[PDB]
């Protein structure tokens, strides 16, 4: 999450360091990045 290179369980329990992200029931920017064509709208020569 940035700079956490501790080899231990950072001692203090899981439900203690940070606050647990309850669920319900690059995410997207990587989705529209990994899809850019380097092709050619004609046909390469030489």
């Amino acid at each position: 999450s940035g700079n956490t290179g501790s080899i231990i369980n950072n001692y203090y329990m899981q439900q203690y360091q940070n606050s647990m992200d309850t669920q319900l029931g690059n995410d997207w920017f990587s989705k529209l990045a990994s899809s850019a064509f380097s092709g050619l709208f004609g046909a390469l020569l030489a």
């Binding site: 050619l40 004609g42 046909a43 390469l44 030489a46």
Partner: protein, 210 residues
């Protein structure tokens, strides 16, 4: 606005693109005469480094500009870069001018230039000018194309041609149909020329400026 046709042609690092494409045409050849000849006795090498595009100016296709103005451009010709230094450090060699000719106005004018790439020559009879339709050549018209392009082979009289004093290739564009600005058409078309020397190898070598 059609069948749709585009195209980019890479030569070394240089790459001309276009949209009013029309295609191309190679004439006479499509290959190259075995450049591993006797006269070069193995003493010839491939230098596909200077193989690429350089710019030079043709005339200016103007309304008046008669039915004949065919600004010539010899090939070879003055080279301020690679291929030129090569001809100054070498005696014998041979290539093949790519040539991708443009002439910008817009899709509204009239008239046509006649692009052609012909070999050994000296000068041409007007009465003959009615047959460029015999050597590698293209036809320009702003209602279909903005670009020409025609890729020429090697002819020379020999396998490994010398250019200090000889230029086998010449490029002409006689005005077949005069230009018409018209109602809303463009004002003038400066015919620009993009060339590139291909599949070329050298043999030979002189001392130095010192």
């Amino acid at each position: 606005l059609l069948e749709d046709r585009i195209l980019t042609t890479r030569n070394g690092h240089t790459t001309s693109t276009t949209q009013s494409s029309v295609g191309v045409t190679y004439g006479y050849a499509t290959a190259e005469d075995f450049v591993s000849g006797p006269n070069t006795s193995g003493l010839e090498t491939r230098v596909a480094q200077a193989e690429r595009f350089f710019k030079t100016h043709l005339f200016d296709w103007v309304t008046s500009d008669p039915f004949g103005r065919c600004h010539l451009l010899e090939l070879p010709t003055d080279h301020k870069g690679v291929y030129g230094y090569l001809t100054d450090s070498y005696a014998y060699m041979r290539n093949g001018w790519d040539v991708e000719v443009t002439a910008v106005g817009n899709q509204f004018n009239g008239g046509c230039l006649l692009v052609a790439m012909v070999p050994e020559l000296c000068s041409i009879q007007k009465r003959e000018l009615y047959q460029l339709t015999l050597f590698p050549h293209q036809f320009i018209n702003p209602r279909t194309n903005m670009t020409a392009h025609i890729t020429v082979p090697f002819v020379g009289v020999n396998r490994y041609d010398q250019y200090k004093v000889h230029k086998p290739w010449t490029l002409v564009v006689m005005v077949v149909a005069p230009l018409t600005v018209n109602s809303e058409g463009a004002p003038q078309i400066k015919v620009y020329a993009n060339i590139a020397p291909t599949n070329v190898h050298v043999a030979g070598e002189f001392p130095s400026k010192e």
